[PDB]
Ligand binder design. Structure first.
Ligand SMILES: [Ca+2]
Ligand SMILES: [Ca+2]
Length: 279
């Protein structure tokens, strides 16, 4: 399949070179997989989700996304127009309030919830968890992400928007999960993106058009936008039988475009997510 005039981030992960505008992908489109979006919630009624999204857990008064951050990330995962895996199943877990904030104890509970809730869902091709959140270092938050990964879920987390070493931020500094950095459309490291030896992969993170609350769309930037690119790609690759949850991050790194990015500090990988699609 080929989506013309696609968002630049989708066209980037299906090309060996920047500047293209078509997103080439296999028609399976992550069908059979499930992706948990642990964020501010999802506007599941958005037409771009085609009824493939639903809220399963909230830690606040309502399950509605009163912010838009979680709806935007879910749209990059698997919306019809702006998603990597356009046929995947989307589950929303609201651990952040409508201001985009949340206590670590609630974030830890949301991860432990996903590790158990996946056992009563029908996801034959695999389960993915996308965490576009983070803060200061916490060994309890890192351990919760490691538990979720060990239970059999592909965990993708954002590296942070501090332009610093991600080793001082959680759950980005957990080695067992897949930490995602951000890049722009000219194959430059996003000026805000964190770095360090803990980063596994980079994704499109600057000026990312996706869904928004109120049935709308908008473009924002952050490593919170690059993470759903890797999460959606994982669900896309697992549906193809190429990899599994325990080794998706390593497979994505092994098959990535190497050496394409600029302004990458020494000690940080120069790897850009890529689906290796061939018609
Ligand atoms: Ca290249
Ligand atoms: Ca890692």
């Amino acid at each position: 399949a080929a989506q013309t005039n696609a968002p630049w981030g989708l066209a980037r992960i299906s090309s060996t070179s920047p500047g293209t505008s078509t997103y080439y992908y296999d028609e399976s489109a992550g069908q059979g997989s499930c992706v948990y979006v642990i964020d501010t919630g999802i506007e599941a009624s958005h037409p771009e989700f085609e009824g493939r999204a639903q809220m399963v857990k909230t830690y606040y008064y309502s399950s509605r996304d009163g912010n838009g951050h979680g709806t935007h990330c879910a749209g990059t995962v698997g919306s019809r127009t702006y998603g990597v895996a356009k046929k995947t199943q989307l589950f929303g877990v609201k651990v952040l309030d409508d201001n985009g904030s949340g206590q670590y104890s609630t974030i830890i509970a949301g991860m432990d919830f996903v590790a158990s809730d996946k056992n009563n869902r029908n996801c034959p091709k695999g389960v993915v968890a996308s965490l576009s959140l983070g803060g200061g270092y916490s060994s309890s938050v890192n351990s919760a992400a490691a538990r979720l990964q060990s239970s059999g879920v592909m965990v993708a987390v954002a590296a942070g928007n501090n332009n610093a070493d991600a080793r001082n931020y959680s759950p980005a500094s957990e080695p067992s999960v897949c930490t995602v950095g951000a890049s722009d459309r000219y194959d430059r490291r996003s000026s805000f993106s964190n770095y360090g030896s803990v980063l596994d992969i980079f994704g499109p993170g600057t000026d990312i058009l996706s869904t928004w609350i109120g049935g709308s769309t908008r473009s924002i930037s952050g490593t919170s936008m690059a993470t759903p690119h890797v999460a959606g790609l994982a669900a896309y690759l697992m549906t193809l039988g190429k990899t599994t949850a325990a080794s998706a991050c390593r497979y994505i790194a092994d098959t990535a475009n190497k050496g394409d990015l600029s302004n990458i500090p020494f000690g940080t990988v120069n790897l850009l997510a890529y689906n290796n699609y061939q018609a």
